[PDB]
Write a protein that holds these residues in place. Structure first.
Motif, short mmCIF file in Angstrom:
data_model
loop_
_atom_site.label_atom_id
_atom_site.label_comp_id
_atom_site.label_asym_id
_atom_site.label_seq_id
_atom_site.Cartn_x
_atom_site.Cartn_y
_atom_site.Cartn_z
N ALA A 42 56.58 60.07 5.33
CA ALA A 42 55.37 59.36 5.78
C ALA A 42 54.91 59.80 7.33
O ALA A 42 53.84 59.89 7.47
CB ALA A 42 55.40 58.07 6.14
N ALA A 43 55.78 60.41 7.87
CA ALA A 43 55.68 60.92 9.23
C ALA A 43 55.11 62.40 8.97
O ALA A 43 54.62 62.79 10.21
CB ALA A 43 56.89 60.97 10.19
N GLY A 44 55.24 62.79 7.84
CA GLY A 44 54.45 64.20 7.51
C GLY A 44 55.48 65.35 7.57
O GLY A 44 55.22 66.40 7.61
N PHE A 45 56.64 64.80 8.07
CA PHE A 45 57.85 65.67 8.03
C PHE A 45 58.56 65.93 6.70
O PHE A 45 58.75 64.79 6.10
CB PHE A 45 58.64 65.42 9.14
N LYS A 46 59.08 67.08 6.42
CA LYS A 46 59.83 67.36 5.43
C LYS A 46 61.43 67.39 5.48
O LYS A 46 61.86 67.95 6.38
CB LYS A 46 59.48 68.89 4.55
N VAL A 47 61.93 66.55 4.64
CA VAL A 47 63.40 66.48 4.82
C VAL A 47 64.07 66.60 3.27
O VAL A 47 63.75 66.28 2.34
CB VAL A 47 63.69 64.79 5.17
N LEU A 56 62.87 52.03 18.05
CA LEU A 56 61.55 51.47 17.96
C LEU A 56 60.81 52.34 17.12
O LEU A 56 60.14 53.36 17.57
CB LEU A 56 61.13 51.13 19.17
N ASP A 57 60.26 51.98 15.76
CA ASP A 57 59.53 52.93 15.22
C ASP A 57 59.98 54.11 15.00
O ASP A 57 60.55 55.02 15.91
CB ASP A 57 58.05 53.17 15.82
N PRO A 58 59.80 54.91 13.76
CA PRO A 58 60.14 56.44 13.76
C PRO A 58 59.45 57.53 14.54
O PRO A 58 59.88 58.53 14.61
CB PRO A 58 59.79 56.79 12.19
N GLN A 59 58.78 56.85 15.40
CA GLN A 59 57.92 57.74 16.59
C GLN A 59 59.00 57.98 17.71
O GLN A 59 58.85 59.33 18.16
CB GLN A 59 57.08 56.93 17.33
N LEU A 60 60.10 57.57 17.73
CA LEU A 60 61.18 57.99 18.72
C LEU A 60 61.87 59.13 18.31
O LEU A 60 61.89 60.11 18.85
CB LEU A 60 61.99 56.94 19.00
N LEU A 61 62.25 59.22 16.90
CA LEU A 61 62.50 60.37 16.33
C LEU A 61 61.57 61.64 16.44
O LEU A 61 62.24 62.80 16.95
CB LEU A 61 62.83 60.26 14.75
N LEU A 62 60.35 61.36 16.25
CA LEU A 62 59.38 62.50 16.40
C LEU A 62 59.35 62.85 17.68
O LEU A 62 59.22 64.16 18.07
CB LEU A 62 58.00 61.82 16.05
N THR A 63 59.51 62.06 18.71
CA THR A 63 59.58 62.48 20.15
C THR A 63 60.67 63.59 20.43
O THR A 63 60.52 64.48 20.97
CB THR A 63 59.96 61.07 21.09
#
Length: 119
Positions: A23-28, A103-110
Motif C-alpha cells: 500500500a505504501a507503493g513499495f515492492k516486497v 506509529l503508522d508504516p510511515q516510520l518504516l518509510l522514513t
C-alpha cells in the motif's frame, strides 16, 4: 523506487506485512528461505532487508552469515527485525532498526528515505 527484501513464514503473516508495504507503493518479496534471498538479492541488490525474528524463524540466520562474509561493502543496506528484538548483541549491533509497534508504516518509510541516494 526501491526494492525491499522480506523473509517470513506463513502466507497469512506475509500477506499482512506485504499489504502494508504494498500500500505504501513499495515492492516486497516474500521468501521462505535465506538461500532463496541470496539468489535474488544478488540480482536485485535491495537497499533494505527485513527478516522475521519469531521462533518459527531460522532461515534468516543464513542471511546474517552472508552479511558477515561481506559485511563491508559500499552503500550499506539496512537490516530490520520484525516482532521482538534479538537477545544477542551481535544482531542488535548489525540491526538497522527494530520493529514491533511503530506509529503508522510511515516510520518504516522514513528509514528507507534516510538513505538519501543521489543519482
Amino acid at each position: 523506487a526501491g526494492h525491499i527484501l522480506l523473509l517470513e513464514e506463513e502466507d497469512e503473516a506475509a500477506t499482512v506485512v506485504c499489504e502494508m508495504l504494498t500500500a505504501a507503493g513499495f515492492k516486497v518479496i516474500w521468501l521462505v528461505d535465506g538461500s532463496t534471498a541470496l539468489d535474488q538479492l544478488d540480482l536485485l541488490q535491495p537497499i533494505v532487508i527485513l527478516m522475521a525474528w519469531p521462533p518459527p524463524d531460522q532461515s534468516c540466520l543464513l542471511l546474517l552469515q552472508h552479511l558477515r562474509e561481506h559485511q563491508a561493502d559500499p552503500h550499506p543496506p539496512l537490516v530490520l527485525f520484525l516482532g521482538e528484538p534479538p537477545v544477542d548483541p551481535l544482531l542488535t549491533a548489525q540491526a538497522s532498526a527494530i520493529l514491533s509497534k511503530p506509529l503508522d508504516p510511515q516510520l518504516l518509510l522514513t528509514t528507507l528515505q534516510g538513505l538519501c541516494p543521489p543519482n
